[PDB]
């Protein structure tokens, strides 16, 4: 239910389907979705979820970001 919803949310931003949200994909999705965010804000959203520091948000980091209170 909520797990499936989180998976679809992740698939919204993993534009190429390789399992990692990159800064380029996030920028493209935000621009395509009509959201008003600067490029620095996109890079900051990536940095906040990037626990392992590889520069991309995998599925588990995304889950942590969504399921954290
Ligand atoms: N090259 C790959 N090798 C193994 N697993 C991959 C690969 N690319 C993506 N995945 C995994 O498969 C998931 C995407 O599955 P699916 O939705 O079937 O792909 P697509 O979005 O290409 O249709 C990703 O979230 C990731 O976990
Ligand atoms: Ca990707
Ligand atoms: Ca990462």
Curated annotation (Swiss-Prot):
Ca(2+) 3 binds at residues 14, 16, 18, 20, 25. Changing residue 61 to V: In LQT14; loss-of-function variant causing impaired negative regulation of high voltage-gated calcium channel activity; impaired regulation of cardiac muscle cell action potential; decreased calcium ion binding. It comes from Homo sapiens (Human). It is linked to Ventricular tachycardia, catecholaminergic polymorphic, 4: An arrhythmogenic disorder characterized by stress-induced, bidirectional ventricular tachycardia that may degenerate into cardiac arrest and cause sudden death. Patients present with recurrent syncope, seizures, or sudden death after physical activity or emotional stress. CPVT4 inheritance is autosomal dominant. The modification N6-acetyllysine is found at residue 15. It is found in: Cytoplasm, Cytoskeleton, Spindle; Cytoplasm, Cytoskeleton, Spindle pole; Cytoplasm, Cytoskeleton, Microtubule organizing center, Centrosome; Cell projection, Cilium, Flagellum. The gene is CALM1. It comes from the Eukaryota. The modification N6,N6,N6-trimethyllysine is found at residue 36. Transmembrane segments: none annotated. Residues 1-36, 37-69 form the EF-hand domain. Residues 1-69 are annotated as: Necessary and sufficient for interaction with PCP4. This protein has four functional calcium-binding sites. The modification N6-methyllysine is found at residue 36. This is Calmodulin-1. Ca(2+) 4 binds at residues 50, 52, 54, 56, 61. The modification Phosphoserine is found at residues 2, 22. Ubiquitination results in a strongly decreased activity. Calmodulin acts as part of a calcium signal transduction pathway by mediating the control of a large number of enzymes, ion channels, aquaporins and other proteins through calcium-binding. Calcium-binding is required for the activation of calmodulin. Among the enzymes to be stimulated by the calmodulin-calcium complex are a number of protein kinases, such as myosin light-chain kinases and calmodulin-dependent protein kinase type II (CaMK2), and phosphatases. The chain holds residues 81 to 149 of 149 of the full protein. The modification Phosphothreonine is found at residue 31.
């Amino acid at each position: 239910d909520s797990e499936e919803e989180i998976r679809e949310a992740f698939r919204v931003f993993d534009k190429d389907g390789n399992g990692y949200i990159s800064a380029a994909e996030l920028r493209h999705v935000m621009t395509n979705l009509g959201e008003k965010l600067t490029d620095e804000e996109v890079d900051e959203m990536i940095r906040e979820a990037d626990i392992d520091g590889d520069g991309q948000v995998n599925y588990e980091e995304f889950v942590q970001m969504m399921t954290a209170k």
